[PDB]
Amino acid sequence: SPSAQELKEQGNRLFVGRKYPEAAACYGRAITRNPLVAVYYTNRALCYLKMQQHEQALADCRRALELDGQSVKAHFFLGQCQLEMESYDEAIANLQRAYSLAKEQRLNFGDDIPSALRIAKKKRWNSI
Ligand SMILES: CN(C)S(=O)(=O)C[C@H]1CCCN(C(=O)c2c[nH]c3c(F)c(F)c(F)c(F)c23)C1
């Protein structure tokens, strides 16, 4: 029987291979072993976003945030999901929160978060 961490790594590898439902199922098996690890929910949320399952992605972000309020990924994925759902004000605030958390945690995503913010703010401006 695989361990929870082995299933998380298998899901991560399947995600790199663009096998999104298969990766999401691996994270579900990891959650069966240990449902108190935020990263299983953040990683599954991005799978759901890639599968256009926005409501399921939002729910996994909420499960992750109840376990790790400092999660850069949960805020970033929540913001990207809200952007796709046209919830622009919410998306921008979550992306800005991911930026602040990433800076406080010394995480390096290059210019991804400011670029995502401009994409979100430009899309918001174009809609209004
Ligand atoms: C499903 N999983 C295999 S996963 O681990 O969620 C895979 C992710 C790993 C990190 C990089 N990925 C990204 O999509 C990011 C690209 N830019 C980011 C960024 F600026 C962030 F703030 C952030 F939180 C991110 F996750 C990303 C993939």
Count of structural domains, the chain: 1
Residue in 37, 21, 27, 35 with CA at minimum distance from that of residue 7: 27
Q: Measured in angstroms, how far is the CA atom of residue 21 from the centroid of ligand 1? A: 17
Euclidean distance between CA atoms 96 and 52, whole angstroms: 23
Give the CATH number, domain containing residue 117. Answer: 1.25.40.10
Backbone angles phi, psi at 68, to 5 degrees: -145, 90
Domain region containing 82: 4-127
Ligand 1: residue of 112, 113, 119 to mutate (most ligand atoms within 8 A of CB) is 112
Do the Cβ atoms of 8 and 27 come closer than 8 Å? yes
CB neighbours (10 Å) of residue 1? 6
What crossing angle do the helices spanning 4-16 and 38-50 adopt, rounded to 10°? 30
Nearest CA-CA partner of 109 in 84, 100, 44? 100
Resolution in A: 1.1
Q: Coil, helix or strand for 23?
A: helix
Whether the CB of 43 sits within 6 Å of ligand 1: yes
